[PDB]
Amino acid sequence: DAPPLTLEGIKDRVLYVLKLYDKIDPEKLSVNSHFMKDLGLDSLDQVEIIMAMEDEFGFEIPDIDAEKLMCPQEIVDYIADKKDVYE
Amino acid sequence: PLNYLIGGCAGGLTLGIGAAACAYMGLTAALVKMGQLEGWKVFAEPKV
Amino acid sequence: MNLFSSLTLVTLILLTMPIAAINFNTHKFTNYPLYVKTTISCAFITSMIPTMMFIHTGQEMIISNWHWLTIQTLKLSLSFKMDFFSMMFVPVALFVTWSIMEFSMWYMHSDPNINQFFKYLLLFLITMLILVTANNLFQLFIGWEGVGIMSFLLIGWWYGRTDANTAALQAILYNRIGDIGFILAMAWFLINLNTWDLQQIFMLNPNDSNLPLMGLILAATGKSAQFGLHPWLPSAMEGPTPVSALLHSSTMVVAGIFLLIRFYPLTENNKFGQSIMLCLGAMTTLFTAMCALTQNDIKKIIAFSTSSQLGLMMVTIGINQPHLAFLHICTHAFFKAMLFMCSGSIIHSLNDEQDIRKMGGLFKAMPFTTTALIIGSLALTGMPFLTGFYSKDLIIESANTSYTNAWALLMTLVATSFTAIYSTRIIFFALLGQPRFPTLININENNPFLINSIKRLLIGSLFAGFIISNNIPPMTIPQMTMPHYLKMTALTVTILGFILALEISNTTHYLKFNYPSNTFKFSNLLGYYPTIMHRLTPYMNLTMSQKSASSLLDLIWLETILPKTISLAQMKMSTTITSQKGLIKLYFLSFLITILISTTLLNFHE
Amino acid sequence: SGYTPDEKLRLQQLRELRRRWLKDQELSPREPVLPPRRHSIFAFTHVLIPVWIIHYYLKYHVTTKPYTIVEKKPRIFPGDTILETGEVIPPMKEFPDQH
Amino acid sequence: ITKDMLPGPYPKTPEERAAAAKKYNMRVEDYEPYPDDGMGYGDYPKLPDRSQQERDPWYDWDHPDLRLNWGEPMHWDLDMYIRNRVDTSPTPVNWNLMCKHLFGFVAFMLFMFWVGETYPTYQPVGPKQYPYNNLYLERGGDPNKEPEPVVHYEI
Amino acid sequence: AFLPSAAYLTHQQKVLQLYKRALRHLESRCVHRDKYRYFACLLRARFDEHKNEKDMVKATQLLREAEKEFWHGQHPQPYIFPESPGGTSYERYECYKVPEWCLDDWHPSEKAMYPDYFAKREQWKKLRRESWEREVKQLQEETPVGGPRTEALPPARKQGDLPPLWWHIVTRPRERP
Amino acid sequence: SFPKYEPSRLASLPTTLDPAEYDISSETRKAQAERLAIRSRLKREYQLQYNDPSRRGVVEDPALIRWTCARSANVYPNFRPNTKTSLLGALFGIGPLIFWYYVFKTDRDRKEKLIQEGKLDRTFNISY
Amino acid sequence: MLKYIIPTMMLMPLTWLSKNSMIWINTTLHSLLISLTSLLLLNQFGDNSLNFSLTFFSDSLSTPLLILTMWLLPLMLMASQHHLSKENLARKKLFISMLILLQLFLIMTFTATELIFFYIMFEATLVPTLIIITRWGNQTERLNAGLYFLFYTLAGSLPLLVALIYIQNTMGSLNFLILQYWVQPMPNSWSNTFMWLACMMAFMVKMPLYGLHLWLPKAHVEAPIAGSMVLAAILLKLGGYGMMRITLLLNPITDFMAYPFIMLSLWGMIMTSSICLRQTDLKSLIAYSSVSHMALVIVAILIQTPWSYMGATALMIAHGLTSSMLFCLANSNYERVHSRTMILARGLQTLLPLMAAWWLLASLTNLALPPSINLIGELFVVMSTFSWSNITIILMGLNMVITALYSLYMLITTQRGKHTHHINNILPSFTRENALMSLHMLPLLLLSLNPKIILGPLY
Numbered sequence A: 001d002a003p004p005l006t007l008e009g010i011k012d013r014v015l016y017v018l019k020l021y022d023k024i025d026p027e028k029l030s031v032n033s034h035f036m037k038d039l040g041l042d043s044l045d046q047v048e049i050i051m052a053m054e055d056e057f058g059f060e061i062p063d064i065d066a067e068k069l070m071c072p073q074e075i076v077d078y079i080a081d082k083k084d085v086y087e
Numbered sequence B: 001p002l003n004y005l006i007g008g009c010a011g012g013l014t015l016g017i018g019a020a021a022c023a024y025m026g027l028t029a030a031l032v033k034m035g036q037l038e039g040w041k042v043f044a045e046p047k048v
Numbered sequence C: 001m002n003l004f005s006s007l008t009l010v011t012l013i014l015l016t017m018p019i020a021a022i023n024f025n026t027h028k029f030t031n032y033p034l035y036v037k038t039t040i041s042c043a044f045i046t047s048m049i050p051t052m053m054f055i056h057t058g059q060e061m062i063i064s065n066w067h068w069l070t071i072q073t074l075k076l077s078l079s080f081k082m083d084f085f086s087m088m089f090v091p092v093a094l095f096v097t098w099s100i101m102e103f104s105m106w107y108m109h110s111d112p113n114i115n116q117f118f119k120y121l122l123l124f125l126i127t128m129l130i131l132v133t134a135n136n137l138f139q140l141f142i143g144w145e146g147v148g149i150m151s152f153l154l155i156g157w158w159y160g161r162t163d164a165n166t167a168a169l170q171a172i173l174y175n176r177i178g179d180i181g182f183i184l185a186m187a188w189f190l191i192n193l194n195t196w197d198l199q200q201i202f203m204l205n206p207n208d209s210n211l212p213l214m215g216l217i218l219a220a221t222g223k224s225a226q227f228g229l230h231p232w233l234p235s236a237m238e239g240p241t242p243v244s245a246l247l248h249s250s251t252m253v254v255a256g257i258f259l260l261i262r263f264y265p266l267t268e269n270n271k272f273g274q275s276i277m278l279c280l281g282a283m284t285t286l287f288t289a290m291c292a293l294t295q296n297d298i299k300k301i302i303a304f305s306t307s308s309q310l311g312l313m314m315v316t317i318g319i320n321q322p323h324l325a326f327l328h329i330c331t332h333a334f335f336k337a338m339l340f341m342c343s344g345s346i347i348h349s350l351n352d353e354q355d356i357r358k359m360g361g362l363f364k365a366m367p368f369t370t371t372a373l374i375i376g377s378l379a380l381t382g383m384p385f386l387t388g389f390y391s392k393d394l395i396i397e398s399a400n401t402s403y404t405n406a407w408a409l410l411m412t413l414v415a416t417s418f419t420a421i422y423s424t425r426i427i428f429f430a431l432l433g434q435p436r437f438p439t440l441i442n443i444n445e446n447n448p449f450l451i452n453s454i455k456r457l458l459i460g461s462l463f464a465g466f467i468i469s470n471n472i473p474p475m476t477i478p479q480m481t482m483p484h485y486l487k488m489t490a491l492t493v494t495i496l497g498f499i500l501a502l503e504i505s506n507t508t509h510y511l512k513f514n515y516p517s518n519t520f521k522f523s524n525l526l527g528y529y530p531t532i533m534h535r536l537t538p539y540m541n542l543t544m545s546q547k548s549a550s551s552l553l554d555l556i557w558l559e560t561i562l563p564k565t566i567s568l569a570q571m572k573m574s575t576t577i578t579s580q581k582g583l584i585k586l587y588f589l590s591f592l593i594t595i596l597i598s599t600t601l602l603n604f605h606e
Numbered sequence D: 001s002g003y004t005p006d007e008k009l010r011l012q013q014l015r016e017l018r019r020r021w022l023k024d025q026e027l028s029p030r031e032p033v034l035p036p037r038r039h040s041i042f043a044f045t046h047v048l049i050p051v052w053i054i055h056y057y058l059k060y061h062v063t064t065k066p067y068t069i070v071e072k073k074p075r076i077f078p079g080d081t082i083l084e085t086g087e088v089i090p091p092m093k094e095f096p097d098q099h
Numbered sequence E: 001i002t003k004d005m006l007p008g009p010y011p012k013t014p015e016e017r018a019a020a021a022k023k024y025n026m027r028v029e030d031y032e033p034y035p036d037d038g039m040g041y042g043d044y045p046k047l048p049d050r051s052q053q054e055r056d057p058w059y060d061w062d063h064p065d066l067r068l069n070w071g072e073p074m075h076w077d078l079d080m081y082i083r084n085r086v087d088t089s090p091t092p093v094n095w096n097l098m099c100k101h102l103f104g105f106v107a108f109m110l111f112m113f114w115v116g117e118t119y120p121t122y123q124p125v126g127p128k129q130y131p132y133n134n135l136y137l138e139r140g141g142d143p144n145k146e147p148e149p150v151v152h153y154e155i
Numbered sequence F: 001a002f003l004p005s006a007a008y009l010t011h012q013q014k015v016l017q018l019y020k021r022a023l024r025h026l027e028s029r030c031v032h033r034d035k036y037r038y039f040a041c042l043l044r045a046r047f048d049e050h051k052n053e054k055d056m057v058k059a060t061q062l063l064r065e066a067e068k069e070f071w072h073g074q075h076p077q078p079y080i081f082p083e084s085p086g087g088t089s090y091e092r093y094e095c096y097k098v099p100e101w102c103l104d105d106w107h108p109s110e111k112a113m114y115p116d117y118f119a120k121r122e123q124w125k126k127l128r129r130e131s132w133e134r135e136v137k138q139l140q141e142e143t144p145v146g147g148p149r150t151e152a153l154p155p156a157r158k159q160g161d162l163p164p165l166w167w168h169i170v171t172r173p174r175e176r177p
Numbered sequence G: 001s002f003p004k005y006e007p008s009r010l011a012s013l014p015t016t017l018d019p020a021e022y023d024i025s026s027e028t029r030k031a032q033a034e035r036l037a038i039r040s041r042l043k044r045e046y047q048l049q050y051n052d053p054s055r056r057g058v059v060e061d062p063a064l065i066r067w068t069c070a071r072s073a074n075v076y077p078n079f080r081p082n083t084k085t086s087l088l089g090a091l092f093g094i095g096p097l098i099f100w101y102y103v104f105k106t107d108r109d110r111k112e113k114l115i116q117e118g119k120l121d122r123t124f125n126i127s128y
Numbered sequence H: 001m002l003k004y005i006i007p008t009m010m011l012m013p014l015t016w017l018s019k020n021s022m023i024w025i026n027t028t029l030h031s032l033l034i035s036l037t038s039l040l041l042l043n044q045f046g047d048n049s050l051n052f053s054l055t056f057f058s059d060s061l062s063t064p065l066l067i068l069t070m071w072l073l074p075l076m077l078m079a080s081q082h083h084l085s086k087e088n089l090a091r092k093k094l095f096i097s098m099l100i101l102l103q104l105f106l107i108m109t110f111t112a113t114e115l116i117f118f119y120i121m122f123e124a125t126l127v128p129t130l131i132i133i134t135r136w137g138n139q140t141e142r143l144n145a146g147l148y149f150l151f152y153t154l155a156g157s158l159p160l161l162v163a164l165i166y167i168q169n170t171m172g173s174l175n176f177l178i179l180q181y182w183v184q185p186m187p188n189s190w191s192n193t194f195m196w197l198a199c200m201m202a203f204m205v206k207m208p209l210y211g212l213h214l215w216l217p218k219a220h221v222e223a224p225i226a227g228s229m230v231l232a233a234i235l236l237k238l239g240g241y242g243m244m245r246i247t248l249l250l251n252p253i254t255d256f257m258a259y260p261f262i263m264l265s266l267w268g269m270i271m272t273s274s275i276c277l278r279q280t281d282l283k284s285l286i287a288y289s290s291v292s293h294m295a296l297v298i299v300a301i302l303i304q305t306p307w308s309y310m311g312a313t314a315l316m317i318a319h320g321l322t323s324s325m326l327f328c329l330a331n332s333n334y335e336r337v338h339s340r341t342m343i344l345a346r347g348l349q350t351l352l353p354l355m356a357a358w359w360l361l362a363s364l365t366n367l368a369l370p371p372s373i374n375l376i377g378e379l380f381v382v383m384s385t386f387s388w389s390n391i392t393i394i395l396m397g398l399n400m401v402i403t404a405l406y407s408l409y410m411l412i413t414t415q416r417g418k419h420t421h422h423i424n425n426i427l428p429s430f431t432r433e434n435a436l437m438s439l440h441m442l443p444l445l446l447l448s449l450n451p452k453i454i455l456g457p458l459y
């Protein structure tokens, strides 16, 4: 049960979810692609991105920390802190 | 005994401590009627 | 005699030997859970021989081997009653416990406190066999409180979780409310019949036995999660899944049913107690199987399933069929332990996902778990000639053809439909359809511990109903003559429940968004009884305990009257006497009025 | 809006120290440094010795005491033979046969 | 711990209320003491009578399992309102409607059980027929006496 | 209302929280993925209809009766994540989360079972005891008069210094001990 | 239209239904900011003692000591005998004693009358 | 009985002539030898009481109390030798001498043939307990604890002194053996009413009765550990012993004068158990539990059936062992967190697993788990009160529910949940503390194997 997570695995899966979202084209997306300034997304779309992360990794991100993750690198680092990867 | 137990409690309500003397004056007045019943001597004559 | 009694006591002492082993430990164990599982497999093999030589002749005996205490008229001896009930229940409990522990060697493998877990599970098994082999009420009270305390310790296995400790305290509260009635029964039997032994109770046979039977029904209401005292059993699913599977499905929660089955010579002469058991069991099997229909956590639904089956057992006690109720205990053990084990295999293959709305698409993903879950569901609903047939079908066929409360029989049939409804609900949301679990598949079930543990209960749920019901001697006269609508009734209402719930299942895929009703909010919020009475009654016993007991009575009112209106009266009488100004006129004028009082008034000069 | 620069700096530095701690929670290959320290024995020691003990106990200390092990008397049918006497229990009256 | 940080008497002046609210580490306007009617509270604050389940569970609490901070004033029933005890959380349904539904369902089921006890079900048969005069010597009848003959015939 | 960094929820934050709670309770009502996705884009269009409402009072009014609509149309037992508060596996492993200071109370015959680990624990505690006074004097050179204003902690600004109040965040126990 | 939520003592009002939550008035801003200032002061004062390496003991909480001293020691010095507490102490302190006195006295008078007239079934009762 | 009084008095030169580091070892050793010898009092007979001399006898009621008293002294020496480790040597020997002098007064309180010598020893036991509480107590209010201890125990015992001398002048003797055969029926009168109150209210204070119990959750709370142990284990049981001696003389006026005290105890066992459900203070929770369990002993003495006296003496011995162990557990955590607040340090099974097992055993014996002698006493008192009145089973079962509730709430709050983050001085369990827990619990567990020695004179 429960295989261990890595920063590479979390990064691959977060970018994998964000390449399956039709409002992001797969060539403009990067690890530091900010959702509002760079990618042209909405606040509501960023909320759905956080909800897709929750459905992906099986835990709730609270709203006070959901509303501060505004790039995929911060999402990967936050899941890394909440799951304690590279132990 | 219950007759003076009321009248001592009502004496506490005209004392000034109201329900405090009700458990004190009526409890002292109850001992008077019981002493009259069973012959209780506080100043007892020396006998032995 | 020399073989029966010997292997009878060897079963229990063989169970107690690993407790001495774990208590006398020095080294790091060479898989102590394998040692406990091997020991209970050997206890099953050992207890089969007295069962086989009960099937051969009917040889029943009582081992009153150790005199413990004699309180002037009551020789309390360690007394082991080996009758039909012990000889059937002990191998079934050992076989199920052996399967639960080989399941537990897989499920609790991540636990570094697995030896304490197997120690506690063996202690629960020892206390339950103390219960079901007891001949006097003190020893049955020992086994009864023992399974209650091991229920506490095994619900609160993850003791850092708040809700697990809450459910453990709740389970203890409801079991002690049942213990009120059990000690009422013991008090009645000691004062009126001078015994705790069942033999003198069965020989004296009192007529005015309303009150001890009311106490025993209250004890069963606490222990078997009947209505009024039921909500600890769904809350008790906060423990680990082997705890729920062994204790709260098949072995612990049958003890109130087993207690009332133990007193069938006293309930057969009391139609009032039979009517109380019938009405209470019908109310339980209605309410719990109706609450099961819209729950979302799978362990809650199987807990309402086993409480509805215990209500059915209470019904068939209430129609003067104790042996059908005990056969349904022995039947129910196999498939309800198997359903909890299949739910545990699903939960472990979905990383502690216990909700059926994040399941599905598990028909081919977990084929052995799908197979055993469907077989357990069909045994639960009353598929013809599985294990559940030979008990539940005869229960309904005897509940139809008797001088019976008619509304109780009708609610029993409604519950019979509801079993099929929640069974296909579990199959539909858990196995059928398409996946809803998160994307990382960790589905794996290919460990021979899990496979053999579900496999032996699978063989049991296929064959043991036929085997046991054709090994048990006839104790009643079965009603086999009845009309065709009245013979087919359980099967018909079961299939109609299947059809109506297939309609309910097919009306989920539609693109309609229905606002919730009041029936859905009733059955989904547990019937509102674990909501109000778990807020209202703990409000009063926690606020009256301070604002009318602690702060009111101890720290104010008995502190006002005994110490402090006395102590105020003494310190003021000082300040009204010791307030003398030190003047010599004030001292001698106090002497003068005494001369005026003692001579003239008091008359001391004569 | 997202984080502030100060929050990003503090979370990054706490993250680097937290990953240092988690990486330094692993073991060395020599750890744990441990100090210097019969085929069917189960069915003998756990069964065949307790059967001996309990059989000796029940045979010479329990059944030598009255009414301790009381057995239900075995079930006598028409047609049996009493092993203490030899008297064959006579069979039943002939049945008014039904089929 | 010192004497002017202990609970004291009921404040009547505003400056005593200000010193009390500074003592209990809260604002003066939010500082509501219990009403002075002899219930033994003194100057102790009236926290708004909630459980600890309603508290924000993702906050980094000083006391996580209590959902409580350091220096934050505690409710008078703080041991009562822990998550191991009484929950005052908001429910999806009103309290009165829950009481109505539960009491109506229980009373209706009990009434229908009583009525079904008044009108039972049975089978189109007579009583069971037992030999030896309704099993007189088997039901514990004394063998020195002899009862009435209970004779069963064919039908 | 009750937050660690600030004291209140803004209007935009309450809009986003109602959006997330509405989608989660909708998925609780709408178990299957495709039917949820249909009604979820319907609900998303219902939110995006009045996205550009410039009046703050009208936006607050629509948010308030949207909360009313949601409170009527919520699920009775919503799907809680298992390790989320209210879930089934929440705070389940806290009985294994022994704090870090209990290693210091070991007997030396079991501290010799892990020589490299405690030989590293000594230099971790060394780093903590030479970082403590410098981060305290960092805290008292940045805190305004009258106390701190928010609960947000400042980072380390210099090189060689560690962020203040870092020990029970870096050395906290794992979620699976 | 929709059923308005009815807040009771055991089911309080949700924050998403409270009318006074959406007040953007500056007294609510100042109140939340002052409560945040107090909570931040107490939070910093806690974790200065909590993260200290020189401490090996209990970070004492004066609110907890004050809570226990309120729950135990401050009951009599701030008690006043008035009408409410007097009727509560007579209603709940001597009340159940008198009630169970009449109940158990009636039961034992009835049982003793039934025994001394020879009616109570007391055949096998020899343990008492 | 002189063969136990003389070694108890030789414990005084054993503690004053020792080396400065040897004063705990020697007293523990020789008090364990005296407790080994205390089992020679078990020479009891089914007809006759073990009547030693004109001054001393020991029937089957006083015998388990004597074994418990002589066993409790080494346990108090083990329990108190950590918090007094920084005490002056002379004050340390004075503490040990107060414990020895208290043992000396107790073991001839229980063996007093004559009742005014029982009274003299029964009131002599106050003054070492007085000195222990109000010298080696902990907080400020230890002087109000002993003041209400000394006032309540003397204001109750003062009419008892006039009552026993009135028996002396009327009957001719206060020998219990003589008054077994010269007891006269005490009729209904007001003089005999106040006679009954004078003979009973002293032990009603010492049990304690509900309503007279307010000295106890201060005298147990402000005491040190040896004081709380001896108070909850023996000094409460002096009231039950005195009632079982004195209700011989108070028949048949007890059969209608016992009703208000039966009501007080049957309702106070509900009230004090509800109070245990809401205690912030762990030592106060154990104190109110002691009141709630002694209320049943008061009921069982006042209904005076054989099953009631058997259950009451079983419950006194069992509750002495159990409450002594619970106070020692509370002190074992007070020696680490320096506060008696129960909500302060939680989750202690995550740090102390074996001590959590001892907490579990003491909690299970607290809630009368069978087959312990706790349950034997509890169950027999419930049987006898059901025979007394059938309606009392409601109060008895409701008390048992609340008893299991506060026992397991104490277990959950002290031992389970999440541990406290800001408490880091939680030491591993010492060998002395686990020795103290085992020497409490193992005799209590062994007495379940042979319970007939603790079932009183009419087993």
Ligand SMILES: CCCCCCCCCCCCCCCCCC(=O)OC[C@H](COP(=O)([O-])OC[C@H](O)COP(=O)([O-])OC[C@H](COC(=O)CCCCCCCCCCCCCCCCC)OC(=O)CCCCCCCCCCCCCCCCC)OC(=O)CCCCCCCCCCCCCCCCC
Pocket: C022, C023, C024, C025, C078, C116, C123, C127, C130, C139, C142, C146, C149, C150, C153, H353, H354, H355, H356, H357, H360, H361, H364, H365, H369, H370, H371, H372, H442, H445, H446, H448, H449
């Ligand atoms: C006269 C000769 C007599 C010989 C036989 C002895 C008779 C019994 C005496 C007492 C036996 C137990 C004593 C040790 C246990 C307590 C300490 C402990 O737990 O240590 C753990 C430790 C091993 O655990 P670990 O993994 O290292 O650490 C544990 C963890 O910290 C985590 O801890 P944990 O929570 O996992 O562990 C605590 C756990 C907690 O377990 C529970 O909570 C479950 C228990 C309750 C439910 C199950 C039992 C219900 C009752 C039914 C059974 C009794 C009747 C059976 C008869 C038939 C039916 C009537 O307790 C146990 O495991 C103990 C098992 C035995 C329990 C007995 C009943 C206790 C319940 C409360 C009282 C009940 C009524 C009284 C019963 C009296 C019976 C005699 O045990 C030991 O090291 C044992 C040391 C040796 C003990 C010697 C005992 C004899 C002392 C007497 C000396 C003089 C006579 C000479 C005899 C010599 C014999 C060798």
Ligand SMILES: CCCCCCCCCCCCCCCCCC(=O)OC[C@H](COP(=O)([O-])OCC[N+](C)(C)C)OC(=O)CCCCCCCCCCCCCCCCC
Pocket: C065, C066, C067, C068, C076, C077, C078, C079, C136, C138, C139, D053, D056, D057, D061, H371, H448, H449
């Ligand atoms: C693995 C090692 C095993 C032991 C090794 C040494 C022995 C080797 C094997 C040979 C066997 C020894 C000879 C036989 C044994 C002795 C037989 C004998 O006469 O013993 C005397 C007696 C037999 O009973 P008894 O009737 O003679 O004694 C009663 C006591 N008197 C007469 C004084 C009133 O005692 C025993 O056998 C004790 C065994 C107890 C076993 C059960 C333990 C129960 C534990 C819980 C206690 C509480 C129960 C509460 C409930 C009670 C019911 C309501």
Ligand SMILES: CCCCCCCCCCCCCCCCCC(=O)OC[C@H](COP(=O)(O)OCCN)OC(=O)CCCCCCCCCCCCCCCCC
Pocket: C162, C163, C166, C167, C169, C170, C173, C177, C180, C217, C218, C221, C227, C228, C229, C280, C530, C533, C534, C535, C537, C538, C541, C542, E083, E084, E085, E086, E087, H394, H397, H398, H401, H405
């Ligand atoms: C055969 C006839 C059958 C008749 C049956 C009908 C009659 C009886 C009806 C039932 C009466 C008792 C039930 C009511 C009280 C229930 C108390 C309880 O268990 O509360 C549960 C509550 C926790 O529940 P919850 O909030 O859901 O937990 C979520 C997890 N965080 O837990 C808490 O809040 C913790 C509180 C701890 C202290 C609770 C104190 C309550 C004590 C109740 C004693 C009742 C005694 C009854 C005596 C009867 C005598 C005849």
